[PDB]
């Protein structure tokens, strides 16, 4: 199950990256840090909290329309 978290963190940082987030040096620094700390974790309950903290970086923009993409 931790492997699911690491793979989805890879995907998350990819989508943040193509949202041009790396044009804000400190934001990209924090995102890179969280992503590299998820890939190195060894217990799934700190990877999950760094994952919510990393996803909040995406939920705080206005580039990805969220309700349409939760078509379920």
């Amino acid at each position: 199950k931790m492997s699911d978290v690491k793979c989805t963190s890879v995907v998350l940082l990819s989508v943040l990256q193509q949202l041009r987030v790396e044009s804000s040096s400190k934001l990209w620094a924090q995102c890179v840090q969280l992503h590299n700390d998820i890939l190195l974790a060894k217990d799934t309950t700190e990877a999950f909290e760094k994952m919510v903290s990393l996803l909040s970086v995406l939920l705080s923009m206005q580039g990805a329309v969220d309700i349409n993409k939760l078509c379920e």
Binding site: C7, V10, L13, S14, Q17, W28, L39
Partner: protein, 525 residues
């Protein structure tokens, strides 16, 4: 200033879902993902270049280095070298970057096309009378790894490679074309190459143990005197083609271009203090010369620093006495004793050397008495001749030869039964193979059908895992086989629903049964 970042890898969700369909990645399994694409922020380039702060001015014991250079040169007698004309050099892949500033106008192909063989030869013969300082770009790498430290290679200008190739390529290609030597560059691991290499390194050593060490920050902590010695050993083959001033001016060009050059990092020129540029024309061989030098001096230190009165073998005592004389009492070479020490080393301390990776089969009961190098000797030698501390957590030792090197070029060794006899196969790290399956640059990675040739090669490298006692390891290889089958018979399906015509005949069923891969580890070919 330019701030260069590193992107994350693309996820190959189909292969991952398939892998978890076959029951992989279950909690508490041994094979798990540890190799990823680690992303890097802006100030990652220079924060890596700054590691050259680990290169300190090191003076060397000259009367001992002058003997070690003779022994190390003796390790290189089997080959032949010299200068070659511009029409004899070989350049695989002309479409690679040409350094700075030439990378503004085209790849190396442009500069190998625009200059006739006479222009190239005039340029080469110009650098035997002049020094051409050059610039070097520093590039970040985008590759799978197990640690988040950024990687970086030195893109050397075309003006340096174009001439270093003509200076060195004859010897460099005579090294890569010799079998059974100490330097094992060029020797393939397939078709029984691994078994032959290991049976060669285990030549006849009487109480054999195997040993392997590790150079911390080998490229950035290498003292300049040892780089110069490496280049001087590589240039000892020019005793007829080049004159003395020519050899000095080529050495000077080498230093000015790949030792203390001007590195162009970010958008700025800095000075490089020393150590190897990892992307020059002779890195993988200069590293081997440096490796042999350190091993030889470890042996010299281990034999000279032993209570001579306690040695019982009255031949080794006289050898120690003569060794001290040859170091600190003699002033010119003593070729007979150089030959004798080299013979002693090859008898009791056989090596297998790739570019700073090494295996040693050594006489255990001599190293127990301090008559050849142990691992503490390597620790001491790197401490005082390399300015790094080598912790014994990165150096391995093995007392059972029927399970070979614990590691060599990132491969473990298994003694399996092929046909009727027992051979040594190199198996990789299952996490590495799975990671190369799951994470990749997009289109290379995400859709397989566009590139099954990838999974065929990955299954070639993942074959010996079939012979592992552990069972998840074998399941890696069988997973790759079933995935190739799925890729193929869904490509034909897509191009049938996209069509009404498809493979009237194929003969690609070989790619999903082991007889095609097995053949790559049996010796005929």
């Amino acid at each position: 200033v330019a701030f260069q970042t590193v992107k994350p890898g693309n996820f190959n969700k189909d292969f991952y879902d398939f892998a978890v369909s076959k029951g992989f990645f279950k909690e508490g399994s041994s094979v798990e993902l540890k190799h990823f694409f680690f992303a890097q922020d802006g100030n990652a380039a220079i924060s890596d270049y700054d590691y050259y702060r680990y290169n300190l001015p090191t003076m060397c014991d000259i009367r001992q280095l002058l003997f070690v250079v003779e022994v190390v040169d003796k390790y290189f007698d089997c080959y032949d070298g010299g200068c070659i004309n511009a029409n004899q050099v070989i350049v695989n892949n002309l479409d690679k970057s040409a350094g700075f500033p030439f990378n503004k106008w085209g790849k190396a192909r442009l500069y190998y096309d625009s200059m006739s063989y006479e222009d190239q030869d005039a340029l080469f013969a110009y650098t035997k009378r002049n020094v051409i300082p050059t610039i070097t770009q520093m590039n970040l790498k985008y590759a799978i790894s197990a640690k988040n430290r950024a990687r970086t290679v030195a893109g050397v200008s075309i003006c340096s490679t174009m001439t270093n190739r003509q200076f060195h390529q004859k010897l460099l290609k005579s090294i890569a074309a010799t079998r059974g030597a100490t330097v094992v560059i060029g020797t393939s691991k397939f078709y029984g190459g691994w078994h032959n290499m290991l049976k060669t390194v285990y030549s006849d050593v009487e109480n054999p143990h195997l040993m392997g060490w590790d150079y911390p920050k080998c490229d950035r902590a290498m003292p300049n005197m040892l780089r110069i010695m490496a280049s001087l050993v590589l240039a000892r083959k020019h005793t007829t083609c080049c004159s003395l001033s020519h050899r000095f001016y080529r050495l000077a060009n080498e230093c000015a271009q790949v030792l203390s050059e001007m590195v162009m990092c970010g958008g700025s020129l800095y000075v490089k203090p020393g150590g190897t540029s990892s992307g020059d024309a002779t890195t993988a061989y200069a590293n081997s010369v440096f490796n042999i030098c350190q091993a030889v001096t470890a042996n010299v230190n281990a034999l000279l620093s032993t209570d001579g009165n306690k040695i019982a073998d009255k031949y080794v005592r006289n050898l120690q006495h003569r060794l001290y004389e040859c170091l600190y009492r003699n002033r010119d070479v003593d070729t007979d004793f150089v030959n004798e020490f080299y013979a002693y080393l090859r008898k009791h301390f056989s090596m297998m050397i790739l570019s700073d990776d090494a295996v040693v089969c050594f006489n255990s009961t001599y190293a127990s008495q301090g008559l050849v190098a142990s691992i503490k000797n390597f620790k001491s030698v790197l401490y005082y001749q390399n300015n790094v501390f080598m912790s014994e957590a990165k150096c391995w030792t093995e007392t059972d030869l029927t399970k070979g090197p614990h590691e060599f070029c990132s491969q473990h060794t298994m003694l399996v039964k092929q046909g009727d006899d027992y051979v040594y196969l190199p198996y990789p790290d299952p996490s590495r193979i799975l990671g190369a399956g799951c994470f990749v640059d997009d289109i290379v990675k995400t859709d397989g059908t566009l590139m099954i040739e990838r999974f065929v090669s990955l299954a070639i490298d993942a074959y010996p895992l079939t012979k592992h006692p552990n069972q998840e390891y074998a399941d890696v290889f069988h997973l790759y086989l079933q995935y190739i089958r799925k890729l193929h018979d869904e490509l034909t399906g897509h191009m049938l629903d996209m069509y009404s015509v498809m493979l009237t005949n194929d003969n690609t069923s070989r790619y999903w049964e082991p007889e095609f891969y097995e053949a790559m580890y049996t010796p005929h070919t």
